Design a protein around this ligand. Structure first.
Ligand SMILES: O=C(O)Cc1ccccc1Nc1c(Cl)cccc1Cl
Lengths: 115, 114, 114, 115
């Protein structure tokens, strides 16, 4: 499990559950091709998105559907979604934990990269 | 000045100066067309990106070239850039302030709509 | 105006208005003595807390009454208040801007020293 | 384990290791009495600070010695430390995860409260 996503809710002080996450990889033609997708669990985490074999060097985009999350709670959010774009494994395989803290008009995202 | 961008540096505790910012608007064909661009000033701010006449309802993407900013400081950042995608509602006098706080492996962004 | 405080609301995407702010300075006996206080304005800012003459080197604590702010909006917050403790160095012309972004169960604070 | 602290480093994209944490409880005389202390592990986490029996209702202060952390890395930080003050268990026992993301001139803290 080289790619993990964790989403927290800053309004309720709880994990953000059932948040849709889509991952894309930049193709040779500068196009974003679907790579993997899923929804966060009860712990606000999403595991098993890919494997070390499939997760090759490249530029990846992790899109977190924050808008749908907030609407389901009756709150009108600012962002359409949260996007995290990064180059991965360019110097060998690494483990990536992408964390996002969500608020209706703000979000913070950090990466924890393990070797 | 309905749209303003402010970028701060969390490592040095200062405005993020000369950060390239590109704004795009989603076109009818779901394509991002260039809308405006510029670089943050000494105060880490970018004003005059557009006018109220030109800034119509739609989905906009504010792209902040964070990578180039960090590389210039000798720090290898994590993100390729920071992106803020939102819908400009246009329902009453509204000024949009997009703020971003930058760290090498993290960034936070908030919108101040007044 | 060497010390300024800015408070934003991450839930409503607006400045945090009328937030009580208390500033303390650590005394010789390791006690926090009141230094200045006020409430954020409509722009979520608090200016004129002190002067360069009065703002000498020392350890300061900026306390933001976040609890009262959230309760007034009908939201039960997590924190009793937000505290920012720092050392004013006083080594060259320096203006201190203490910014805080508030959410019911979270807050972020950054210092912009220019 | 009703009280957990997790600290991340936003500059290096890694857990903040060996960060000293001191917890205090407000006494009857409005004084902060030492409650527990420890240092974050390799995963940037601090467990076993207290037990459900000892962690009674009250106002607690979690102090994270961020200054010492940054100085050890050769960076001059802004804050003397990060403090998180909250009322705990006022409506029954809860599990509290106090998370902090650190940068030299900024820090963010969130609480995840479980029942
Ligand atoms: O915008 C963000 O998310 C970064 C951040 C973090 C903590 C405290 C304040 C801020 N942002 C900020 C600042 Cl530094 C100035 C003016 C307006 C805003 Cl929204």
């Amino acid at each position: 499990c080289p790619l993990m996503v964790k989403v927290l809710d800053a309004v309720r002080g709880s994990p953000a559950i059932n948040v849709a996450v889509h991952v894309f990889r930049k193709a040779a033609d500068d196009t974003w091709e679907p790579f993997a997708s899923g929804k966060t669990s009860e712990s606000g985490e999403l595991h098993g998105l890919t494997t070390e074999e499939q997760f090759v060097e490249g530029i990846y985009k992790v899109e977190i559907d924050t808008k749908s999350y907030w609407k389901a709670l009756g709150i009108s959010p600012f962002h359409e979604h949260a996007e995290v774009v990064f180059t991965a494994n360019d110097s060998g395989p690494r483990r990536y934990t992408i964390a996002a803290l969500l608020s209706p008009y703000s979000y913070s995202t950090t990466a924890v990269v393990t070797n």
